Sequence to fold (1982 residues):
Amino acid sequence: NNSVPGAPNRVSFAKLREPLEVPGL
Amino acid sequence: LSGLTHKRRLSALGPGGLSRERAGLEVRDVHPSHYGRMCPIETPEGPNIGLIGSLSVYARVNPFGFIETPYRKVVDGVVSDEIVYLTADEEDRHVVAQANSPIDADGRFVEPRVLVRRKAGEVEYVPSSEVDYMDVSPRQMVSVATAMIPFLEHDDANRALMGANMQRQAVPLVRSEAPLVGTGMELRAAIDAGDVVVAEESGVIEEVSADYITVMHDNGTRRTYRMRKFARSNHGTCANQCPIVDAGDRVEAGQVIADGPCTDDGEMALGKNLLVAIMPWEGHNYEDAIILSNRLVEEDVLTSIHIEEHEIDARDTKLGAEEITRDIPNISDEVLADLDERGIVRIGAEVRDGDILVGKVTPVRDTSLKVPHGESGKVIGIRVFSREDEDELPAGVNELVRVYVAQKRKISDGDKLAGRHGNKGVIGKILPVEDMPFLADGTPVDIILNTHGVPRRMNIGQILETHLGWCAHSGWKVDAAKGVPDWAARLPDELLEAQPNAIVSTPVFDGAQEAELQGLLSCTLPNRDGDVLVDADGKAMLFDGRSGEPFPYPVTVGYMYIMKLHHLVDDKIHARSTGPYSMITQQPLGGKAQFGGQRFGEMECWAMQAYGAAYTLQELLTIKSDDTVGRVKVYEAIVKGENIPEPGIPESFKVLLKELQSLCLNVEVLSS
Amino acid sequence: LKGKQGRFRQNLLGKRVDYSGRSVIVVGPQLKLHQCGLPKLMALELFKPFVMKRLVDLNHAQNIKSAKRMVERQRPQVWDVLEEVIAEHPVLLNRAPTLHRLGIQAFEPMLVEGKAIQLHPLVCEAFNADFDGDQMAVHLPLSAEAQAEARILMLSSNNILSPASGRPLAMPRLDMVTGLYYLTTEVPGDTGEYQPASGDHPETGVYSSPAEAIMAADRGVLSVRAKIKVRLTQLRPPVEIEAELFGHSGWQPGDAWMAETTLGRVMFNELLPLGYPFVNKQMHKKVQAAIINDLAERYPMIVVAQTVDKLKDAGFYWATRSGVTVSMADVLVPPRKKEILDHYEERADKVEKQFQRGALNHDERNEALVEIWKEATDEVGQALREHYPDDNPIITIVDSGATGNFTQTRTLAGMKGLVTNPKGEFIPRPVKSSFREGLTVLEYFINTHGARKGLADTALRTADSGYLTRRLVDVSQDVIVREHDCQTERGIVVELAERAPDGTLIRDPYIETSAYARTLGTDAVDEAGNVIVERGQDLGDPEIDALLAAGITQVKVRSVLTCATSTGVCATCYGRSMATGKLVDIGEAVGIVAAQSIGEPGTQLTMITGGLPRVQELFE
Amino acid sequence: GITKASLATDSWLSAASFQETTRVLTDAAINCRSDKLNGLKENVIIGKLIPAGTGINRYRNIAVQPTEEARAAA
Amino acid sequence: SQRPTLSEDVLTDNRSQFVIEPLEPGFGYTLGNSLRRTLLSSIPGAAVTSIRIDGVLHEFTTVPGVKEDVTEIILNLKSLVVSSEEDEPVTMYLRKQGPGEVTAGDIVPPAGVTVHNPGMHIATLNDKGKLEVELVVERGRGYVPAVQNRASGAEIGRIPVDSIYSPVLKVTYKVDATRVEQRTDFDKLILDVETKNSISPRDALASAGKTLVELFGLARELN
Amino acid sequence: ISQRPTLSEDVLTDNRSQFVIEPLEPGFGYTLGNSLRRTLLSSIPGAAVTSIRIDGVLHEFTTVPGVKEDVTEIILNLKSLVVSSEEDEPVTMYLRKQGPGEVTAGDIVPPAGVTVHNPGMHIATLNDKGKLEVELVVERGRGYVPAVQNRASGAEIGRIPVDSIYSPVLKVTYKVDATRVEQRTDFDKLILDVETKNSISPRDALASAGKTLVELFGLARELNVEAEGI
Amino acid sequence: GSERVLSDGDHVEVGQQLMEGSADPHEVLRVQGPREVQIHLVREVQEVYRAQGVSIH
Amino acid sequence: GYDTPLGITNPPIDELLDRVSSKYALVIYAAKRARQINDYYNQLGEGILEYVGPLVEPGLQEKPLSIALREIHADLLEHTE
Ligand SMILES: [Mg+2]
Ligand SMILES: [Zn+2]
Fold:
């Protein structure tokens, strides 16, 4: 679910899914 | 990160707003309607507390100016994927659920009673039907800076605020490294930070270079990006860009192409990874001090670059126009050996404190610009603006020239360091690499932290961070032949098998639990020598470097992220014995740059009076501040072997007389 | 002349002086008490004229200008003279902003590399300094007069006793106390302990002298803290044994006696000054304070400083090996917290239903909830304390008085409990988790308020205390001890210790302050004709003990309040000084000392209010 | 109170230093109030040695010479 | 009962184990620690001192054709390891032009010096640019700040570089004790040392032994 | 590199001493100090007593008849006795007296070789019609060895092993001090402190320790050939 | 005893406060003299300082 | 009856106070002697004498004030109140 094309892969202690990406900061 | 936070800031003072003295104290406190709009943690430490907040992660301003916040509306007890944005008033008039409350995959509430937030400061369980709104993510109330502090749910409010404020003071290093443990909001906070370029259209790179890049679009249009190298930042630090792409790769649109300062492969990196140990060590780490191995100094692990900046100008005058010229009256050839024909120092020439940096003549006197007190380094570039070449200049000037001096600073004694959990410190002493304690396999540690400061400050999060960092660094492999252990039920199926120097990320308010760490620490991969260093608890057996015998008890070790603050030591240190004197007040100048003495407050006068010391106070007030002839005579006597003559009449008292005599008040002396 | 910039006022705000310098401070444990470290890059630039003169004297240069040029260029011919020219030249340190008398010391310099002004650990409390970026200036006396001034009066080794009360301030403070506690602690059933003769086997655990004990401990057959029976030879035994074994004939070096203690206690007692009776009890911080006070009240200051330095060195050495660390396995959760929380939550539900009936209002519900949750927090804290053994580093740190309290440990392991609100009233919503287990979003949001309020409170308190101190210093500038003795008779009478109707004597809980240092007005002759304390003789710890032994209750004591001197006060009336330990010397200012002492504690004064405003109103 | 106790003193210079400089200066000027340099505040404003500690005349005027016994034995 | 110690070697690819026994009780730890301390800081070696890049006046800049600036190549060159046989500053050359990669094996050392790791990656070049770098190799021990060359007052084209003369990388020891009640109570020391391949472990151990022997010789003389 | 030679100074007292080495390269302070202390403390060979016997007592719980002192006090007093031996084999020694009076170490009859360096030392005192016979064995060794290591020893009636002290030195302590030989101003200045028995002089014990340590490092040096500074 | 209530018809000593609070220094001074007000001020300030736990002579 | 100190604290402070009346007198009582010693040193190229030189034999380049304090401890000076 890496939105950017080629970001480094770092698995996360994910338990819940956020239904929207962070809006443009 | 500092730039992004400043761009996202929310001020409350200034023109058109309340002042410091008139603003009430209650306004500086939280309000139950802040949840989702303004972060409650991030705030300046100074007196401007509560008047400067920061937008929440998901907050977006409505077209009128009322902050909003996303929500998904539950219709009949079933969660809705579609989302809407609600303002404060509409938020009050509804029921807002809890994101962390368990929810079934089908949208069914497993629990009949789910906690909830109500009108104001009211929370209470309610049946699982009347609930109307549910939040989106657990991280919906944190600021941008606070969103990247791992294990934020374990620290204290003050400590979390201190760490968040500290994160905005790092210094870009020379060779950055991504943190081993950090939230998933690092790369996103960097792409939007603007300080990293990114391709617009999916193309294939033809060639790359240290100074520029050329990517070929799929439509046949060649485009080029220029990357500024070693350009002084707005605050004195350096900025660069080093492309991370190879020749002949079809780079997709939106893929980072260059890493700016504090970046590593398109993600924030404000510090390095050091092997820490927690134990009081011969009092050198007493009361927040810190000890560093010389390996950091000799390997440029924490070496930074700082670029100074100076400028001189030749502005016209009624008596004539000043001109920069190589020649200067009554100066030896050696002194001006650096200046070139045009009258400026050649590029790439070392400059020492007190040296001449650019020569000019004043109608002729000498007023050349010289390096201030306490600067050194190379000269990287010179910019000269000339009115002849049709270059806009401020009115009344002809030639303004600025010179950049860049110095490489290696971390030394008296420098600040701090983790992400707000635990400051100073480098008490840098022992040789042969003296630090070393693991059972010969791996000397790099930094030692005190332990008495952990439980009083109550920032236990950093201990968990250290444990997880060691676990991630060494790599783990959880047993699964007999089946997933009960403590490993909720772990992602792809997180059970890691590699050495693996990368992990724990989102705020949703991360590895204590059971997860307990299980992981029991399955770390063995060292190449075949043995495992740390125990299940996380402690290890060390070996003293001085005595050479093992410590009686095990100690904790692990990799913890360490930044570097901007409060360096070279800026602070300063001395002054004799130098330029002010002309209007007859007092020595002030400030490090001007080479001036220190201030002597009245409290020092009270302290001196308390001890009964009289002559010392007399000296401090008369012979070293005001009396001109006194200063000259004492300096001459010291140069010779003669005793210091008694001080005279201070200039302040004589000025007071000659001023009070002007109001017709005949002020006599009555020496009798 | 008038206003803030009026030349009258601006003459008092201070002037910018020469021969100065500021830098960061870093603790250094390798220095004696009367010592400090200066970076060479600062010392060479601050001693320039002396170096130039002494160098031209040695014929390394021809004139003064050439010597100055060479000093600027820093040739290798200068460092030797720089070391030779600061042999015994004192310098003055001043942490900004200085607050009290002890805020300006005078240390001997010592060259050391780096760019930080090293310091001694035991003096940081005098400056209230924290080694997290604080900066202090460095002045230097020039004339032959200021040198003696700063060498005799302002020296650091001569100001162990704080001016507030005549009790030492420079004492083991934060870390070394833990080392001493570990060293002097006793444990049963250790390795190599003493045992009794068991039939055919002798009694083991007896060593001829501490040397053999140290060797055995080094070899690895004797833990440093175990019950032993050593045979000391250079430590006066406790009076209870001195008067019995030797029949009061008097111990002298060279007389042996069989002690029963642990090697750690002997190694600790070896640090104390010779002749002091053996001390054979575990060293809680209170015991440390008592021992240091006794040493300061029975021996000269220099011996106290030397023994304090040695004790600090030993504490630092032995703190590292105490094995005090922090880990997840150390912060241990309570075993049965869940059942107690369930029961208290059930009772909370009961009162909730009671309110649902509608009989009670909101206020009664709030009161019931707050009291219930306070009781629950107390119960959980009791259970948590009953759970932890005496080996966890947290318990060892907290119980030994090193720092902190038990409430912080309860928060870190048990329950944080109800938390304050912006209005100051306790929210009806209590947190049910500890920082170890992990909070939730709502609880943290609720918790933020206390931190915000505390920050604001400190921010206002600092300025309030500063203003109060300034005013108090302003009022009493011109009090100075002029005459040696007013020869007056009016002496305020203070009840030393009351005699209980059933008991024989009860020490007044404030004898430590009212009549501890004042000069005794009239002799307190016992019921019989014998005189226990004679007229004029200053009071003190041994004399206070003697008075208590005599059973005297009411005593008339000479005071400064009724002093008959036209200006200032008579010295005999003022009584025993604070920093000197003896009668005040003629000419010493007392007004400034009093103002500083009364104003310094203003920082911690917080809330008819009872805080600093109360004192302001009272004095006004 | 402390304020009223400190506003009324004997030396005019310190009083002018504290508050209402013009009024007290005028009042002192009319009376020709000549004051000795007594106290610390005025004595430190002037710059002369403070009359406290090592400044009192009882100690500022001391003559010290080696005892005749030492002089006899060099 | 009483025998002098003896030192033997157990060999591996590049890290060797040394076994010393029998030693008197409570004495192995101190000896091992002393050897480790004298091994990691007082072993003579040689390393690059200062470089000279043609067409470049200082270090805070770049050069056309390369992918990384001067600082990165300096950092990479710090990893270079060389051994000096002559006791004077010698000079090497590094000339590589055209597209491709430039490694440690492209240096042409003079007589009396060698580069033992030709596989290191220095940088990469695009066809546009070329490169010619001259570097010095002096012999020292310990560690010296780069600024040493700043005061020499050379021309502009000289760039100082930090020198790190140390061939040893890691050292560790464990003691195998025998605490039986018999008079065979001794301990066996197991010292392991690994080098940067500049010198074999035996040479470094011999150098450390000689250093300590010469240092302790000052006490054996009758006082 | 020759660097700068390191000279060993010296100070004198009744039987103590403060040997000083100055200056040393940065970090060599402890490198010398710790190993030198350990060698001094547990390398120098010596002689001492190992076991005793009292035919007047069957075990250790009680005390010998007709003597003021207790068995444990007797053991402690007899342990501190300084005995020098030149014969490897364990030889015996006898102490016998009769009638009231005191007993001194000098009154013990020594066989060939062994000697006692303190004859005026007190052991115990006897009342009227008192007697005690002891047969203590003496052995040569190094360092400290507890009696537990001598527990299993044949089969006898009243063998009571005592913790021996096989060393002429019994106390050592050292520090490190900074020094300024140049702009470095970090060179270490070792300060040793030794206090030996009467059977050896400190300047000789230190010399023997240095001899042993140099002989030990001769193995390290001998593996190859390579030189260093003074 | 402090627990006792203010009972009418009893007797009191001169200068004592009848109810909780603070007595104006002027009144106690005029009705007692300087000594009583001095000691009362000293005791009150000492009490307020002893409240926080700090100690001064 | 205590370990000999090192540094500027030798001689100690209490020993001096037994001689001088009060600590405030001692500072001047020593500073004036230091001034006299410095004056004696200054007239060393040619001989003009106003006061004698050090009584106790000095060390190796010791500050004059140290000599003054170390000779006051020996009870070799007499002063006027
Ligand atoms: Mg601080
Ligand atoms: Zn009086």
